[PDB]
From a paper:
Phosphorylation of a conserved tyrosine (equivalent to Tyr15 in human CDK1) in all eukaryotes, and additional phosphorylation of an adjacent threonine (Thr14) in metazoans, located within the glycine-rich loop (G-loop) of the ATP binding site, inhibits CDK1/2 activity.
The CDK2-cyclin A-CDC25A complex was phosphorylated on CDK2 Tyr15 and Thr160, and the CDC25A was catalytically inactivated by mutating Cys431 to serine to generate a stable ternary complex. The CDC25A catalytic domain bridges the bi-lobal structure of CDK2, binding on the opposite face to cyclin A, to form an extensive but discontinuous interface of ~1260 Å2. Substrate recognition by CDC25A is driven by the CDK subunit, and this interaction is mediated through three distinct CDK2 regions; the G-loop (connecting the β1 and β2 strands of the N-terminal lobe, residues 9-18 containing pTyr15), the activation segment and the GDSEID-αG helix motif. When in complex with CDC25A, this G-loop is drawn away from the surface of CDK2, positioning pTyr15 into the shallow active site of CDC25A. This longer C-terminal tail coverage reveals a helix (α6), spanning residues 495–524, which binds at the CDK2-cyclin A interface relatively distant from the CDC25 core. Specifically, the CDC25A C-terminal helix interacts with the N-terminal αC helix (PSTAIRE, residues 45–51) and C-terminal activation segment (residues 145–172 between the DFG and APE motifs and includes phosphorylated Thr160) of CDK2, whilst providing the only point of contact for cyclin A. The interaction with the C-terminal cyclin box fold (C-CBF) of cyclin A is relatively remote, forming a small protein-protein interface of ~170 Å2 mediated by the loop linking α3′ to α4′ in the C-CBF. This generates an interface where the GDSEID motif provides a negatively charged surface which binds the positively charged CDC25A central helix, α4.
Author numbering:
A (entry chain B): 168 to 430
B (entry chain A): 1 to 298
C (entry chain C): 335 to 524
The structure:
């Protein structure tokens, strides 16, 4: 509240983020252009990144930024299977250097790598990722829009916020079909789904004016988010469910998804 | 690199030394800032990464321009547009007669526009001081040295504590506030504003405790009425001296009523009640702002 | 400004303008005269902390200087057992480095901060801190007589690069650990 919520620039910052998320958007369906990796390897890598971030107590913004960097790098560069983890590590490192007050050292990133890549290799890959991304490391993420959306709920409910974060992180694992949705749309769908699941409310009328997103235009993303919320227990990658079972996240992954959507 | 013909070099030693070079083919004067990565055991520094990432989006007349980045596995070169001198050098050269009031008004207006542009793009400069403000011959002042800049969220989180230069550090950072925001930058401007009027630093402290005592001496010791929640701050002690607020007539004599009111709003204790860059541009102090040309003695 | 940190008297040395306006500088001529016996009666102790790395210390330094390249070392040497002054004399502490731009000023600021923390305002153990203007390079150029051994070892020498990287890593690790500990102590009692 007050200068913490930036009341003079919040609308300007939101408009700037909306205009920026188009530029930092990865190419849709870049995995077809990749002749050695598919979406399963990407999902495994993102799950491993979630586990790594949970190990070092990194921010969720770091993980979202790292996944964005990985997607952008792969959308313009072709890598082999054995190198994929390396680029992930590099992206994570870069994300930390952009977000964390105390980012982990390169030695730690080689350690969690399990010594399949050396420190020189990690630094070379970091240089390559920085060159390919053209130092465009400031990218809007689902976290950045969800955090702004959380200010429009009255009364506040930390369970809703934690469930929205959990759904937004679940959307990170699967490239299909969340590569075709902007971070703002996924954040809006996650916020509405969390509100419906926890308190039974819907997409606020103060947010349809701010973002222009009605419940009708959020439906294509909402259906997919609901489908993979229902299928979360059966997913091969279960690191996010374990991470969000903790009491700091209010055990949101232990909740029951709604049987049907009132949309 | 070989494309740029080095002409002059300023910055004693190997400490972010900059080179005034000229483009060989187009004859453009640029400033090359050198960053070492062979001596950096952890790759590209976080400060350089943040500065390059955030300066590529800030396109304003009052923000320094990052023309190009020369990327090499052992060296990093940041190419900036060349500006003749910083504001500290200008004040030192103009230490006898002082900076004329219309020039101070124009410089403050331009700095506030640049800060408003920075804040509307979620960037926190966090290193605002006269050494980081670059002027030119035409009469334009620009923010520079975005190495300490950061991109914040709405609302902000807990960020880096040791950021602003001690002379221009906000009282909320000194008192160890959990959250700081754009109001940290405005305070700096306020201090710079006073430094432009009185030709001397407003709060020249040699330590955090001395800096807090100087701020309290000039503006009065805060309490729960002026700054609610100040008594429960981690770095606040109930043993602080109970000083009285000095009237701004003696703090900044040359300033008029409008300038005094703007300075008092910029130096507000409570970050919530502190003025913003966007709201400062609408102040009556800038009713008759005109842009003069500095003499540029140096 | 024009008074020492405890606000009791002015600075004895002829101050020189420097890169940092926070601190008070002295050109190598003043320290050359001081080491030549110019203020024997008015100065009780004269400390010249060589804030450079030890491999620079072995490559030439001012006579009577003490090499303290770490903040913990300086706190141990200066503040754990402070040099008690008396009436009629003053204790002057001079910091320097290769160029007196990053390391010497940082050590001077750290000493002032730790002296303020450990005392009651405005009492200070070392109210007179100077930084040698131009660093050790200018002193070597102008006062090579007092530099034993008469040699100059740059920080970015083609040799001792591993030592420089190790020392930088140690400084970075210490600063990061101190910052994290302070942040935790602040957030536990916010």
């Amino acid at each position: 509240m007050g200068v913490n919520e930036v009341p003079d620039y919040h609308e300007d910052i939101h408009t700037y983020l909306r205009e920026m998320e188009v530029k930092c958007k990865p190419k849709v369906g870049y995995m077809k252009k990749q002749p050695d990796i598919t979406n399963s390897m990407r999902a495994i890598l993102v799950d491993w990144l979630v586990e790594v971030g949970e190990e070092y107590k990194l921010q969720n913004e770091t993980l979202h930024l790292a996944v964005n960097y990985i997607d952008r790098f792969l959308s313009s560069m072709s890598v082999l299977r054995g190198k994929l983890q390396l680029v992930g590590t590099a992206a994570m490192l870069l994300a930390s250097k952009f977000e964390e007050i105390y980012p982990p050292e390169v030695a730690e990133f080689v350690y969690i790598t399990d010594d399949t890549y050396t420190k020189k290799q990690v630094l070379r890959m970091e240089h390559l990722v920085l060159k390919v991304l053209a130092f465009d490391l400031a990218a809007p993420t689902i976290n950045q829009f969800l955090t702004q959306y959380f200010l429009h709920q009255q009364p506040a409910n930390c369970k809703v916020e934690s469930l929205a974060m959990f759904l937004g992180e679940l959307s990170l694992i699967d490239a299909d079909p969340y590569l075709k949705y902007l971070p703002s749309v996924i954040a809006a769908a996650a916020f509405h789904l969390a509100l419906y699941t926890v308190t039974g409310q819907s997409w606020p009328e103060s947010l349809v004016q701010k973002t222009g997103y009605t419940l009708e235009t959020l439906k294509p993303c909402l259906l997919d988010l609901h489908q993979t919320y229902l299928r979360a227990p059966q997913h091969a990658q279960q690191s996010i469910r374990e991470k969000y079972k903790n009491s700091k996240y209010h055990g949101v992954s232990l909740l029951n998804p709604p049987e049907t959507l009132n949309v | 690199m070989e494309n740029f013909q080095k002409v002059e070099k300023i910055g004693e030693g190997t400490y972010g030394v900059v080179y005034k070079a000229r483009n060989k083919l187009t004859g453009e004067v640029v400033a090359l800032k050198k960053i070492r990565l062979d001596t950096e055991t952890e790759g590209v520094p976080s400060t350089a990464i943040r500065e390059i990432s955030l300066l590529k989006e800030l396109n304003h007349p009052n923000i320094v321009k990052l023309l190009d980045v020369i990327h090499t596995e052992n060296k990093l070169y940041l190419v900036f547009e060349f500006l003749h001198q910083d504001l500290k050098k200008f004040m030192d050269a103009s230490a006898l007669t002082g900076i004329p009031l219309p020039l101070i008004k124009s410089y403050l207006f331009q700095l506030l526009q640049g800060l408003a542009f920075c804040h509307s793009h979620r960037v926190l400069h966090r290193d605002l001081k006269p050494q980081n403000l670059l002027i030119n011959t035409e009469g334009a002042i620009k923010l520079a040295d975005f190495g300490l800049a950061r991109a914040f969220g709405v609302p902000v989180r807990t960020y880096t504590h040791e950021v602003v230069t001690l002379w221009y550090r906000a009282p909320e950072i000194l008192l160890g506030c959990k959250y700081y925001s754009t109001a940290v930058d405005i305070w700096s401007l306020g201090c710079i504003f006073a430094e432009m009027v009185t030709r001397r630093a407003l709060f020249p402290g040699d330590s955090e405790i001395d800096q807090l005592f100087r701020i309290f001496r000039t503006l009065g010791t805060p309490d729960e009425v002026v700054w609610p929640g100040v008594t429960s701050m981690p770095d606040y002690k109930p043993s602080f001296p109970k000083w009285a607020r000095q009237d701004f007539s003696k703090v900044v004599p040359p300033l008029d009523e409008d300038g005094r009111s703007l300075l008092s709003q910029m130096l507000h204790y409570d970050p919530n009640k502190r003025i913003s860059a966007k709201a400062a541009l609408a102040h009556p102090f800038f009713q008759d702002v005109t842009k003069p040309v500095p003499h540029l003695r140096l | 400004s024009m008074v020492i940190g405890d606000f009791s008297k002015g600075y004895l040395f002829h101050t020189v303008a420097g890169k940092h306006q926070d601190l008070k500088y002295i050109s190598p001529e003043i320290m050359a005269s001081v080491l030549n016996g110019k203020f024997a009666n008015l100065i009780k102790e004269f400390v010249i902390i060589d804030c450079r790395y030890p491999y620079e210390y072995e490559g030439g330094h001012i006579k009577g200087a003490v090499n303290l390249h770490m903040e913990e070392e300086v706190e141990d040497f200066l503040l754990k057992k402070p040099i008690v002054p008396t009436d009629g004399k003053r204790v002057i502490v001079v910091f320097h480095s290769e160029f007196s731009s990053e390391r010497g000023p940082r050590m001077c600021r750290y000493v002032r901060e730790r002296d303020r923390l450990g005392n009651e305002y405005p009492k200070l153990h070392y109210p007179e801190l100077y930084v040698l203007k131009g660093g050790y390079k200018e002193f070597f150029m102008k006062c090579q007589s007092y530099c034993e051994p008469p040699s100059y070892r740059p920080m970015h020498h083609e040799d001792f690069k591993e030592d420089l990287k190790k020392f930088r890593t140690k400084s970075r690790t210490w600063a990061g650990e101190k910052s994290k500990r302070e942040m935790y102590s602040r957030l536990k009692k916010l």
